[PDB]
Design a protein around this motif. Structure first.
Motif, PDB file in Angstrom:
ATOM      1  N   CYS A   1       7.789  58.598  86.797  1.00 37.13           N
ATOM      2  CA  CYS A   1       7.662  59.950  86.814  1.00 37.13           C
ATOM      3  C   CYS A   1       8.292  60.870  85.383  1.00 37.13           C
TER       4      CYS A   1
ATOM      5  N   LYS B 114       9.903  63.231  85.593  1.00 37.30           N
ATOM      6  CA  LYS B 114      11.049  64.063  86.606  1.00 37.30           C
ATOM      7  C   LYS B 114      12.226  63.370  86.400  1.00 37.30           C
ATOM      8  N   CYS B 115      11.910  62.571  87.414  1.00 39.11           N
ATOM      9  CA  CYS B 115      12.772  61.321  87.324  1.00 39.11           C
ATOM     10  C   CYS B 115      12.648  59.973  86.747  1.00 39.11           C
TER      11      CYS B 115
ATOM     12  N   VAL C 233      10.680  57.124  87.622  1.00 37.95           N
ATOM     13  CA  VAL C 233      10.265  56.397  88.257  1.00 37.95           C
ATOM     14  C   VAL C 233       9.060  55.693  88.101  1.00 37.95           C
TER      15      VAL C 233
ATOM     16  N   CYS D   9       5.069  61.436  92.835  1.00 38.54           N
ATOM     17  CA  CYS D   9       6.966  60.189  92.844  1.00 38.54           C
ATOM     18  C   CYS D   9       6.189  59.102  93.946  1.00 38.54           C
TER      19      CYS D   9
ATOM     20  N   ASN E 294       9.226  57.448  94.331  1.00 36.76           N
ATOM     21  CA  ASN E 294      11.405  57.696  94.384  1.00 36.76           C
ATOM     22  C   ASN E 294      11.293  58.984  95.394  1.00 36.76           C
TER      23      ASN E 294
ATOM     24  N   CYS F 296      12.435  62.144  95.076  1.00 35.75           N
ATOM     25  CA  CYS F 296      12.364  62.985  94.100  1.00 35.75           C
ATOM     26  C   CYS F 296      10.627  63.245  94.860  1.00 35.75           C
TER      27      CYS F 296
HETATM   28 ZN   LIG Z   1      10.379  61.146  90.821  1.00 35.45          ZN
END
Ligand SMILES: [Zn+2]
Ligand SMILES: [Zn+2]
Length: 74
Positions: free
Chosen positions: A22, A24-25, A27, A40, A42, A45
Motif C-alpha cells: 500500500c 499509504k500504510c 502493507v 488496501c 489493512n 487503512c
Molecule cells: Zn493501506
C-alpha cells in the motif's frame, strides 16, 4: 528454483517482483487482476488506489485521470 514455497513474506524474496504494498500504510497487498480496483488489506487503512501507479484510485474511476497499465503513451 523453488526450494521452499515462498510462503514467508518476511524474506520478501517474492514480493520483490510478485507483489507490492500500500502506498499509504505500506502493507503487503496482492493484485486481484480485475478492473485494477485495488484496495488496501489493512483494516486500519482500506484505502483504494490504482495498483498500476500506486496512486489514488478515485481520479482513475472514469473521472478524468487516465493511467497506463502496461502500454505507456510516454
Ligand atoms: Zn493501506
Ligand atoms: Zn494509475
Amino acid at each position: 528454483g523453488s526450494k521452499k514455497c515462498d510462503d514467508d513474506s518476511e524474506t520478501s524474496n517474492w514480493i520483490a517482483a510478485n507483489t507490492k504494498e500500500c502506498p499509504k500504510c505500506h502493507v503487503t497487498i496482492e493484485k486481484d487482476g480485475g478492473s485494477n480496483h485495488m484496495v488496501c488489506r489493512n483494516q486500519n487503512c482500506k484505502a483504494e488506489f490504482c495498483w498500476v501507479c500506486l496512486g489514488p484510485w478515485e481520479p482513475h474511476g472514469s473521472a478524468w485521470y487516465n493511467c497506463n497499465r502496461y502500454n505507456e503513451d510516454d
